[PDB]
Design a binder for this molecule. Structure first.
Ligand SMILES: [Mg+2]
Length: 529
């Protein structure tokens, strides 16, 4: 039989827990045991890939959504998968909200069995993103769990599942083996017979195994990866596609008129952006785990499927390392070294220095700021690194006293989480607001576009909305995007082929729990033997 050796997580020892609703479970439970209704391929525009459902449709008013269940799907014990399972599972999370790890109860007010193979979700808000959120919620077997005395402690050690790997073939403290569902609805597509899951205590133990070609699918940091791993074996590969954006935010409402003269000037923001060497920041501060973000809108290569490439290309030159271009733009904009001290003054002739902050102890951010300070000095922009404690860094943004700040941003499946949290002016005021929108650039058309993004279920309309957002942010160079993080991923072609890669970039490739596309990925693999 073909065994695929995977490492979704580290453990000090294997504890047999396949309850998909508990934080303490094994990280091969979701997707591989409990298959979703739909897997959203987030890298491909968040396009739905229909699995246990064959379709869904939102109501015209976006207040409900129906899913058509695929007929002929079996649980691993042979019983039919039906709407009863979906209704049961959402009812369990409503009754036991400690099992609702994602807070789906906020969005779904009720779930209706329309017929044996159709379920209707009634929603608390007109919101076309709720199908995506629904897709993340594990669906368990009503005919089993109805008999479970306490689902919040149930370890589910003999799981009955819909997904590809439900058979607990081997379970020991050091290793478990999870073998193919003998009733799998998509069995013809599944060529891997079992997941082999070794107990690995830490990243150093993983390193020794991966360089010896003992693993197939991993998602860990590998030091010196090209020399020690990738170049060492023609079967050793990796692919680190772009994840979440990180950027310098500038304070458009800086109280200091000299600093405001610089920061509230689009040519200055573009020159600041051209001074940065993003790839060197990624290589030094982030150990190589990232991708340059050269989108003026911050969209990033994670969401290239959403990009208007005309807009990206028009402003990409302002977000590329270009020392001579940076100096030329500063001069054209009137930022000239008038006193000869090596640094540019504002067009009105005022000296200024930008205080660039990141949180104390966040070493990767701290090193990014220091690198940026040196890069900015090369074009004549006077900057100093500051490392206040997080509460002070955050307060300076909430109160609008900071100059420039380096920050990351929330992760989302589409560009809305980044663009809304990072730019909606409604998030610049109020009790409890986080830092992410506190550049104090305001555009009410931008706000309206964001507020409309999930008020349509038409993807062509959403793409048009995204393109309008992208244009507004890019043409104003609102922030200075630096980099995108990495979906960490290494793969071995010794025993299997079909892997996703830069040459075959079919989706997010990581093996982590929480990556629904790992189900699609394992269905593309083929044993060499
Ligand atoms: Mg000067």
């Amino acid at each position: 039989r073909s065994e695929l050796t995977i490492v979704p997580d580290f453990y000090p020892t294997m504890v047999r827990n396949f309850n998909p609703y508990l934080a303490t479970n094994l990280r091969t439970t979701t997707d591989f045991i409990y298959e979703p209704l739909v897997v959203f391929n987030e890298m491909k525009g968040n396009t739905p890939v229909f699995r246990l459902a064959e379709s869904y449709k939102m109501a015209d008013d976006l207040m409900s959504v129906t899913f058509d269940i695929r007929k002929g799907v079996k649980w691993s014990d042979g019983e039919a998968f039906t709407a009863d399972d979906v209704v049961y599972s959402f009812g369990l999370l409503k009754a036991k909200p400690e099992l609702d790890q994602r807070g789906i109860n906020k969005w779904v007010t009720s779930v209706e069995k329309v017929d044996e193979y159709k379920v209707r979700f009634r929603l608390s808000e007109a919101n076309s993103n709720v199908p995506y959120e629904i897709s993340l919620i594990p669906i368990v077997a009503e005919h089993v769990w109805k008999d479970v005395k306490d689902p919040t402690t149930f370890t589910n050690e003999n799981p009955v599942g819909t997904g590809p790997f439900t058979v607990i073939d081997t379970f020991t403290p050091q290793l478990y083996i999870q073998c193919r569902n003998p009733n799998y609805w998509d069995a013809a597509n599944l060529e891997v017979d079992c997941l082999r899951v070794p107990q690995i205590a830490n990243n150093d133990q993983l390193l020794g195994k991966i360089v010896n070609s003992e693993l197939d699918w991993t998602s860990s940091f590998v030091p010196d990866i090209d020399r020690t791993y990738a170049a060492a074996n023609p079967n050793h590969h990796y692919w680190y596609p772009a994840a979440g954006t990180q950027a310098f935010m500038v304070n458009f409402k800086n109280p200091d008129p000299a600093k405001k003269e610089a920061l509230d000037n689009v040519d200055f923001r573009r020159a600041f952006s051209m001074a940065l060497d993003r790839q060197t920041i990624i290589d030094i501060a982030f150990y190589g785990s990232g991708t340059v973000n050269d989108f003026a809108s911050g969209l990033g290569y994670a969401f290239e499927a959403w990009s208007d490439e005309a807009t990206h290309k028009k402003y990409k030159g302002f977000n590329t390392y270009d020392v001579e271009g940076s100096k030329k733009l500063l001069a054209k904009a009137g930022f000239k070294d008038v006193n000869g001290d090596g640094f540019v003054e504002t067009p009105s002739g005022k000296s200024f220095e930008l205080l660039i902050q990141s949180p104390n102890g966040w070493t990767d951010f701290n090193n990014t700021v220091q690198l940026a300070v040196e890069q900015l000095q090369e074009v004549g922009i006077k900057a100093k690194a500051r490392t206040p404690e997080f509460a002070v860094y955050n307060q300076a943004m909430l109160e609008g006293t900071y100059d420039v700040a380096y920050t990351n941003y929330f992760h989302g499946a589409d560009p809305f989480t980044y663009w809304n949290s990072g730019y909606n002016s409604a998030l610049q005021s109020g009790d409890g607001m986080p830092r992410f929108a506190m550049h104090y650039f305001t555009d009410k058309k931008l706000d309206g576009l964001l507020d409309s993004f999930y008020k349509t279920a038409d993807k062509n309309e959403q793409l048009a909305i995204a393109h309008g957002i992208q244009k507004i942010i890019a043409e104003n160079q609102v922030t200075i995007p630096v980099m995108s993080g990495a979906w960490m991923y290494q793969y071995n072609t010794t025993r299997f082929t079909g892997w996703w890669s830069e040459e075959n970039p079919k989706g997010r490739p990581s093996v982590w729990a929480g990556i629904p596309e790992r189900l699609l990925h394992v269905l593309d693999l083929k044993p060499v033997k």
